[PDB]
Design an enzyme around this catalytic site. Structure first.
Site, mmCIF file in Angstrom:
data_model
loop_
_atom_site.group_PDB
_atom_site.id
_atom_site.type_symbol
_atom_site.label_atom_id
_atom_site.label_comp_id
_atom_site.label_asym_id
_atom_site.label_seq_id
_atom_site.Cartn_x
_atom_site.Cartn_y
_atom_site.Cartn_z
ATOM 1 N N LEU A 40 0.789 -1.230 0.000
ATOM 2 C CA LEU A 40 0.000 0.000 0.000
ATOM 3 C C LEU A 40 0.823 1.282 0.000
ATOM 4 O O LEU A 40 0.295 2.329 -0.396
ATOM 5 C CB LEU A 40 -0.911 0.063 1.236
ATOM 6 C CG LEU A 40 -1.918 -1.060 1.367
ATOM 7 C CD1 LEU A 40 -2.679 -0.912 2.681
ATOM 8 C CD2 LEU A 40 -2.875 -1.095 0.175
ATOM 9 N N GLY A 41 2.068 1.245 0.446
ATOM 10 C CA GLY A 41 2.891 2.455 0.476
ATOM 11 C C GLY A 41 4.252 2.167 1.085
ATOM 12 O O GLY A 41 4.513 1.073 1.586
ATOM 13 N N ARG A 42 5.114 3.181 1.059
ATOM 14 C CA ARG A 42 6.475 3.022 1.553
ATOM 15 C C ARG A 42 7.078 4.392 1.836
ATOM 16 O O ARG A 42 6.874 5.350 1.078
ATOM 17 C CB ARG A 42 7.345 2.257 0.545
ATOM 18 C CG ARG A 42 8.810 2.181 0.895
ATOM 19 C CD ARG A 42 9.485 1.137 0.025
ATOM 20 N NE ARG A 42 10.935 1.270 0.013
ATOM 21 C CZ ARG A 42 11.741 0.519 -0.734
ATOM 22 N NH1 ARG A 42 11.233 -0.422 -1.528
ATOM 23 N NH2 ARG A 42 13.056 0.704 -0.691
ATOM 24 N N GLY A 43 7.800 4.466 2.952
ATOM 25 C CA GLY A 43 8.406 5.696 3.401
ATOM 26 C C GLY A 43 9.849 5.455 3.763
ATOM 27 O O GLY A 43 10.374 4.356 3.551
ATOM 28 N N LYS A 44 10.490 6.480 4.331
ATOM 29 C CA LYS A 44 11.912 6.389 4.628
ATOM 30 C C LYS A 44 12.212 5.295 5.637
ATOM 31 O O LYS A 44 13.276 4.678 5.565
ATOM 32 C CB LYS A 44 12.441 7.728 5.141
ATOM 33 C CG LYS A 44 13.942 7.727 5.399
ATOM 34 C CD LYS A 44 14.450 9.089 5.834
ATOM 35 C CE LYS A 44 15.916 9.028 6.276
ATOM 36 N NZ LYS A 44 16.350 10.251 7.012
ATOM 37 N N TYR A 45 11.300 5.028 6.576
ATOM 38 C CA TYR A 45 11.598 4.105 7.665
ATOM 39 C C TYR A 45 10.594 2.965 7.752
ATOM 40 O O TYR A 45 10.572 2.275 8.770
ATOM 41 C CB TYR A 45 11.677 4.822 9.014
ATOM 42 C CG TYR A 45 12.684 5.958 9.069
ATOM 43 C CD1 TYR A 45 14.067 5.727 9.005
ATOM 44 C CD2 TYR A 45 12.248 7.262 9.200
ATOM 45 C CE1 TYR A 45 14.981 6.781 9.059
ATOM 46 C CE2 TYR A 45 13.142 8.320 9.255
ATOM 47 C CZ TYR A 45 14.514 8.080 9.191
ATOM 48 O OH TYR A 45 15.410 9.125 9.242
ATOM 49 N N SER A 46 9.785 2.731 6.717
ATOM 50 C CA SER A 46 8.774 1.686 6.805
ATOM 51 C C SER A 46 8.207 1.355 5.432
ATOM 52 O O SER A 46 8.417 2.080 4.453
ATOM 53 C CB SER A 46 7.647 2.118 7.746
ATOM 54 O OG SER A 46 6.922 3.197 7.184
ATOM 55 N N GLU A 47 7.462 0.241 5.384
ATOM 56 C CA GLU A 47 6.674 -0.159 4.223
ATOM 57 C C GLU A 47 5.381 -0.781 4.709
ATOM 58 O O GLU A 47 5.384 -1.548 5.670
ATOM 59 C CB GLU A 47 7.397 -1.189 3.371
ATOM 60 C CG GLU A 47 8.650 -0.653 2.714
ATOM 61 C CD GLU A 47 9.223 -1.580 1.669
ATOM 62 O OE1 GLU A 47 8.545 -2.551 1.288
ATOM 63 O OE2 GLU A 47 10.364 -1.323 1.240
ATOM 64 N N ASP A 151 2.761 15.737 11.461
ATOM 65 C CA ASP A 151 2.795 15.431 10.024
ATOM 66 C C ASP A 151 1.378 15.354 9.473
ATOM 67 O O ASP A 151 1.028 14.452 8.704
ATOM 68 C CB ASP A 151 3.599 14.169 9.749
ATOM 69 C CG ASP A 151 3.994 14.022 8.300
ATOM 70 O OD1 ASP A 151 4.063 15.038 7.546
ATOM 71 O OD2 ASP A 151 4.241 12.838 7.949
HETATM 72 O O1 LIG Z 1 -4.287 7.987 -0.204
HETATM 73 C C1 LIG Z 1 -4.054 8.544 0.845
HETATM 74 C C2 LIG Z 1 -5.042 9.492 1.470
HETATM 75 C C3 LIG Z 1 -5.313 10.604 0.479
HETATM 76 C C4 LIG Z 1 -6.480 11.499 0.706
HETATM 77 O O2 LIG Z 1 -6.949 12.158 -0.184
HETATM 78 N N1 LIG Z 1 -7.035 11.513 1.961
HETATM 79 C C5 LIG Z 1 -8.166 12.342 2.310
HETATM 80 C C6 LIG Z 1 -7.755 13.753 2.688
HETATM 81 C C7 LIG Z 1 -8.941 14.641 3.053
HETATM 82 C C8 LIG Z 1 -9.840 15.024 2.091
HETATM 83 C C9 LIG Z 1 -10.884 15.859 2.414
HETATM 84 C C10 LIG Z 1 -11.076 16.277 3.709
HETATM 85 CL CL1 LIG Z 1 -12.410 17.350 4.082
HETATM 86 C C11 LIG Z 1 -10.200 15.869 4.669
HETATM 87 CL CL2 LIG Z 1 -10.446 16.307 6.349
HETATM 88 C C12 LIG Z 1 -9.128 15.059 4.352
HETATM 89 N N2 LIG Z 1 -2.832 8.366 1.494
HETATM 90 C C13 LIG Z 1 -1.776 7.549 0.953
HETATM 91 C C14 LIG Z 1 -1.900 6.122 1.482
HETATM 92 C C15 LIG Z 1 -0.655 5.486 2.017
HETATM 93 C C16 LIG Z 1 -0.859 4.021 2.310
HETATM 94 N N3 LIG Z 1 -0.945 3.762 3.736
HETATM 95 C C17 LIG Z 1 0.042 4.020 4.578
HETATM 96 N N4 LIG Z 1 -0.258 3.701 5.816
HETATM 97 C C18 LIG Z 1 -1.541 3.217 5.757
HETATM 98 C C19 LIG Z 1 -2.371 2.752 6.770
HETATM 99 BR BR1 LIG Z 1 -1.749 2.664 8.563
HETATM 100 C C20 LIG Z 1 -3.646 2.343 6.463
HETATM 101 BR BR2 LIG Z 1 -4.803 1.658 7.826
HETATM 102 C C21 LIG Z 1 -4.100 2.382 5.157
HETATM 103 BR BR3 LIG Z 1 -5.858 1.836 4.716
HETATM 104 C C22 LIG Z 1 -3.298 2.831 4.127
HETATM 105 BR BR4 LIG Z 1 -3.923 2.896 2.343
HETATM 106 C C23 LIG Z 1 -2.001 3.254 4.453
#
Ligand SMILES: O=C(CCC(=O)NCCc1ccc(Cl)c(Cl)c1)NCCCCn1cnc2c(Br)c(Br)c(Br)c(Br)c21
Ligand SMILES: [Cl-]
Length: 328
Positions: A40-47, A151
């Site tokens: 689902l995703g990946r960052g500097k210190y995790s996946e 963040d």
């Molecule tokens: O796509 C997104 C969110 C993007 C987005 O538009 N948001 C809504 C923002 C928003 C919009 C309108 C309003 Cl009005 C408000 Cl307030 C807030 N972010 C990347 C995902 C990274 C993957 N990822 C990492 N860690 C995770 C965990 Br932990 C879980 Br659980 C799950 Br599920 C996932 Br997927 C995870």
């Protein structure tokens, strides 16, 4: 020196074990109960992976940590444990390790992460109010628990727009607030960094998160995303000053005795504060109201100590339609 207006003493009033994360000893369960399904995703210190718990068929999300960051792992774990049951904070189900390598991982509740395919065109005025209110519940909760997220940004807000569920994720930068403590300004993500970070002011507090929140609100109601689009950290402050004004920036610096890096003198220019109505046009007018603008004006303030708290924001008239629907 500067001090939060709310929740300033709450860590000192708690047992030391609450905030002394270096002394925390997590209990590490068995990652072998989980089957990874999809990245689902990946960052500097995790996946991060979607996964199944094979013992009970539960769908979850597993964040596999780079193990060398031991202090940072304890911090994130203790914060998540302190936030258990908090409204709209991602639920930590368990802390697990690969039983052979001992690499640690965090198991979270699964959320449907709606893929907004049209840059949020599908959200109405009411939807924006509703989800902002949900996000504010999470921030008021963590602040009340003595924790700054540090963040806040769209990436870290999961919304399941089917079930109308919101979760604030990624507590890896979060930190306990202690009055007068000087924090690292290398936090948050560029577009969401408050002016205090950009001018190297270390004595910040929960109000940093309220700046980030305000940036999100501006981008939702005006549809300019990100709202303040710096090309680097220097330019980020210039983009802010073009809206909030240069004389106004200098008054903030003077109040808190903040030294400004002299590279800014060559790039800030001179800018009068802008009226928020300047950002309205035919493409966003249905999302903007006097209430929205008043709330925004009270969030996107240089002076961190004068920004609304999460609770004060929740109590603003902009959210009255949400509260009324929440009870009617
Ligand atoms: O796509 C997104 C969110 C993007 C987005 O538009 N948001 C809504 C923002 C928003 C919009 C309108 C309003 Cl009005 C408000 Cl307030 C807030 N972010 C990347 C995902 C990274 C993957 N990822 C990492 N860690 C995770 C965990 Br932990 C879980 Br659980 C799950 Br599920 C996932 Br997927 C995870
Ligand atoms: Cl820090």
């Amino acid at each position: 020196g500067s001090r939060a207006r709310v929740y300033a003493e709450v860590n000192s009033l708690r047992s030391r074990e609450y905030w002394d994360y270096e002394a925390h000893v997590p209990s590490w369960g068995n990652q072998d109960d989980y089957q990874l399904v999809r990245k689902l995703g990946r960052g500097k210190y995790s996946e991060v992976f979607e996964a199944i718990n094979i013992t009970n068929n539960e769908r979850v999300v597993v964040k596999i940590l780079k193990p060398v960051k031991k202090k940072k792992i304890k911090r994130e774990v203790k914060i998540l444990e302190n936030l258990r049951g908090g409204t709209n904070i991602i639920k930590l189900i368990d802390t697990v390790k690969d039983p052979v390598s001992k690499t640690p991982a965090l198991v979270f509740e699964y959320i449907n992460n709606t893929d907004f395919k049209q840059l949020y065109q599908i959200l109405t005025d009411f939807d924006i109010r509703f989800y902002m209110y949900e996000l504010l519940k999470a921030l008021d909760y963590c602040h009340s628990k003595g924790i700054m997220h540090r963040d806040v940004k769209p990436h870290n807000v999961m919304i399941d727009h089917q079930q109308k569920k919101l979760r604030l994720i990624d507590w890896g930068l979060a930190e306990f607030y202690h009055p007068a403590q000087e924090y690292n300004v290398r936090v948050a993500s560029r577009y969401f960094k408050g002016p205090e970070l950009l001018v190297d002011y270390q004595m910040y507090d929960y109000s940093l998160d309220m700046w980030s929140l305000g940036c999100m609100l501006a981008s939702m109601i005006f549809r300019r995303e990100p709202f303040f689009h710096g090309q680097d950290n220097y330019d980020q402050l210039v983009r802010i000053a073009k809206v909030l004004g240069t004389e106004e920036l200098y008054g903030y610096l003077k109040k808190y005795h903040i030294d400004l890096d002299p590279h800014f003198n060559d790039i800030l220019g001179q800018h009068s504060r802008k009226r928020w109505e300047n950002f309205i046009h035919s493409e966003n007018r249905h999302l903007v109201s006097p209430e929205a603008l008043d709330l925004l004006d009270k969030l996107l303030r240089y002076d961190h100590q004068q920004r609304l708290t999460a609770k004060e924001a929740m109590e603003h008239p902009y959210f009255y339609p949400v509260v009324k629907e929440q009870s009617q």
